[PDB]
Every structure is written in structure tokens, then in C-alpha cells.
């Protein structure tokens, strides 16, 4: 199976965004975070972030940000692939999330979203 | 004829998208994949991908991604040119596709799309 | 007059767009092409293209692509400046066009588009 | 707590935007500045700016500009994190403010915006 | 006062836009030009341009272009800051404009636009 694609939430909507600049561990960073809803269902796995110069995958900062902003605009159904327990900055983890955003795929029905499933 | 333009599907719509980051073969990659339908019907050749640091044509990652997102938004009729049997990562081919996306052109009628035919 | 601004069509609409990647003449390229509307016909006329690593003006590939996509979306009337007889790859010229896209300007009326004119 | 995240205004709207190029202190700059409202309420903390080659955080100019422009388009409620007393150019400070823009987060309700509140 | 911010036109709309490529002085350039109106009136200062590799401020070409395109799309009221007598190639000035685009700010009402204003009636 694809490394880092094993943990996801499906048929969610991106209902909040954050974008900022921040010094972390003595390095100048950019970050963004997505916040999620699942229609009217309560979701606890509801935030994930990406940082330009830290993480398991530094590539794709601008493309992932633009992709997140696209689905915030449409409110469309997506699946979010993420990795738990990534961010080591304790102030960032408590403010935003520990989770690193890995991929965003669309869902065309209540049962199908693109990408691998477990 | 144009090299790599011999294999295409016409009058389709991009009805799904994926964008992600992924380690493949020791390289840090970005990728995106488009999912297709043919009007009211599903089609069997229905996913094509592009990878920033692998493939027959590594250029144009951001422009092809922006172009794909554009037609996902409009739902317009397009022709997709693609190349078969490209991606060699077995986990990736199984989750997404083995096909490399080459070009996207528009269709102004049920019978005409821009670009060369065979 | 401005070099490369002598040849244009005014008050046209872009009704088709192509974007691709392609190996031409030993180089890896990106290109896009616009097709122009002719009455109610589906087939476009006067297609014009831009290539990132070939042409009289290699600069501005992404900005010209985004400008072309913009007017394809709005369907607005534009003036297109282009250079005839540029592309030499025969397969490309047969598939798309020989013309290089130089500039796109708006038309605010049936009578006025921005940019220089010739008589 | 996150350094530079202690000062913010919540549930505001970006109702004006400036973008320009400018020589400041012998350096060629770009800048943008956001103007804020909060519905009908009189606010005094209502302008924040970012400069490409000056400030505590020079990274993220284009991404922050595009983020500010998006919320100006939607008129949606946001939280603005900012740093007071940053700009030293007296002419710039008089025309806009001394405040450096740090982050923009969305507000999904009258009581919630993403990001830390301490 | 902010250098290069002394001449502007307020409460205008961008109602035309040009983008192109052009060779000048041995350099390959990109440029764009905006056309303006003041509601239903034509104005005297109605065009201004930015060039990627010429001008007093070469930075910000893409950001300025995207900003101008945005306001052309929305038709919203803006203030345009510009500098006179920059483009001195007569065929470019005849085709487009002599003025360099410096900044674009919004006007949220008929009475307010963002950005610096001159000190007084004589710009002392």
C-alpha cells in the first residue's frame, strides 16, 4: 500500500482555513491548516496542517494550499489523507493540530472518493 | 504525427480530482490524478495522473494541475491525451493509475474537440 | 509601430483551448493553443499558440495561458495580436497552428479594442 | 503559546485592500495592506500590512496577498493576527499603519475562528 | 509623503485590459495596460501600464497583473496610483500609455479609498 495513505476521513467538507507565518524551532515558516465538518455529523478528526519547511513531506506547499482553498470555496465533498502525531512544536500542536495533511481527493458519491482505501 | 498524442479519449468530463504528496522510489513527489466520466456513463479508462519528478514529461506540473481543476469546476467536455504504462510504482498504479496525462483540450460540440486525431 | 503588433483580429471570441506537454525538435516543451469562434460553427478558426521554449517571445508563457483561459471562460470580445508562420515542427503545425500568440486585449465596444491599429 | 500569535481581532471582514510597489529605505518593495470592518461597529484597529522585503516575517508575501484577496471577495468573517509597531518608514506608517499582518483564519460562527486565542 | 504616491485617480473602474509580449532595447519584455472609466464618464488619465523588465519599479509584475485582472472582472471602484512620463518609446506610448502603474487600492464608498493622499491642495 502507499506509504502515508493509510489514515483518512471520507465525505467531509473543508469549512475553515488558516494561513500564517511563524517562527518554529528557530526557523521561518509558513503554514496552513484546514478545518473539517461532516455535514451535520460531529467530527473530532477535524484539523490538519502543512508547513513549508517542516514535516514528512515539504513539497507541494503552494499547490496543497491552493487545493484546500478551492474546496473551501466550493464546499464539495472530499477525502482527506493525513498523518497523526507529526508536529513537534508543542505551541503549534495545541493551537492547530498535530496532524500533517497528505492528500485531498474528491468524492463523487456517498461511497466513492478517489484514492486508496484500507 | 505528434509523438505521445496517439492515445486519447474524447467528449469526457473530469468528474474527480486527487492531489497529494508521496515518497516514491526514494524521491519526494507531488502528484495529481483526474477521474473521468463520459456524460452519463462510467468509462473504464477513467484515471490519468501527472507526477512532478517522474514521467516522460516532467514540465508543466502546476499548469496541468490548474487546467485539470478548471475543467473539474466547469464540467466542460474535453479530450484527454494520455500515455499508457508509465508509472512503475506498484502501490501507486494500484491506488491511482499507470497512465501519464499528456494534454487536455476542449470540445465545442459532441463531435469536435481541438487537437490531432488518429 | 510596435514590432510584432502589425497582425491582429479584432472583436473575436475564444471558443476552444488546448494545453499540453510535448517533445519537439529535441526539447521538452509546454504549449497552449486558442481557437476562435466563427459564427455558430463548432470548429474553431485562426488557431494561435504559444510554446514555453520556442518562438519569437519565450517569456510570458504562464501569464499568456492564464489570460487566454480567462477570455475562454468569459466569452468576451477581444483583439488578438499574432505572428504568422512561426512554428516549424510539421506535426505540431498540422495538429494545431503555425501562428504565435503575441498579445490579447479587450474590446469595450464593437468599435474599440485596446492596442495599436494598422490601416 | 505561539510567538507573534497573541494579538488578533476576530469576526472582522476585509472591506478594503491596497497593493503597490514602493521604494522604502533604499530598497525596492512590494506591499499590501488590508482594511477591516466589523459589521456596524466602530473599530480603531482596522489596518494591517505585509511587505515583501521588510518585517519580522518576510516569507509568504504572495500566499498572504492571495489569501487577503480571497476574503475581500467573499466578505466572510475572519480573524486577523498582527504584530503592533513594526514598520519604521514614517511615510508608510502615516499612510497605512505600523502593524504587520501575521495570519488570517476563517470564522465559521459568531463564536469560533480557527487558531489560538490566549 | 510616500515617494511615487502623489499622482492618482480615485473612484474609477478598470474597463479594459491588455497583456502582451514585446521586444524593446534588446530585452524580451512582458507588459500589461489598464484602461479606466469614472462611472459613465470618460476621464483624461485613462490608461497606465507596467512592464516586467523596465520602469521605476520592476518588482511585482505578476501580482500587479493579477490585481488588475481581478478589478476588471469585478468592475469595483478603485484608486490607481501612477507615475507620468515613464514609457518614452513613442510607438508604445501611442499604442498604450506613457504612465507607469504604481498601486491599486479599493474604494469602499463614494467618499473613501484606501491609501495615502496628498497633504493639501498644492501637495506641499
Numbering used by the authors:
A (entry chain B), B (entry chain A), D (entry chain E): 22 to 139
C (entry chain D): 22 to 140
E (entry chain C): 22 to 145
Copy text verbatim from the article accompanying this structure deposition.
Typhoid toxin is an A2B5 protein toxin and an important virulence factor for the human-adapted bacterial pathogen Salmonella enterica serovar Typhi, the causative agent of typhoid fever. Typhoid toxin contains two enzymatic subunits, PltA and CdtB, which dock onto a pentameric delivery platform composed of the protein PltB. It was recently reported that the same enzymatic subunits can assemble with a different delivery platform composed of the protein PltC, forming a distinct version of typhoid toxin. Here, we determined atomic-level structures of the pentameric PltC subunit, the fully assembled PltC typhoid toxin, and the PltC pentamers in complex with glycan receptors.
Close inspection of their oligomerization interfaces revealed that the monomers of PltC, PltB, and ArtB interact via similar structural elements—mainly loops L1 and L2, β strands β1, β2, and β5 and helix α1—to form a homopentamer. However, while there is appreciable overlap in the intersubunit interactions of ArtB and PltC, the specific residues and chemical interactions involved in the intersubunit interactions of the PltB homopentamer differ substantially. Electrostatic surface potential analysis of the interfaces of PltC-PltC, PltB-PltB, and ArtB-ArtB shows that it is mainly electrostatic interactions that facilitate subunit pentamerization. In contrast, the PltC-ArtB interface shows electrostatic attraction interactions, consistent with our observations that these proteins can form heteropentamers.
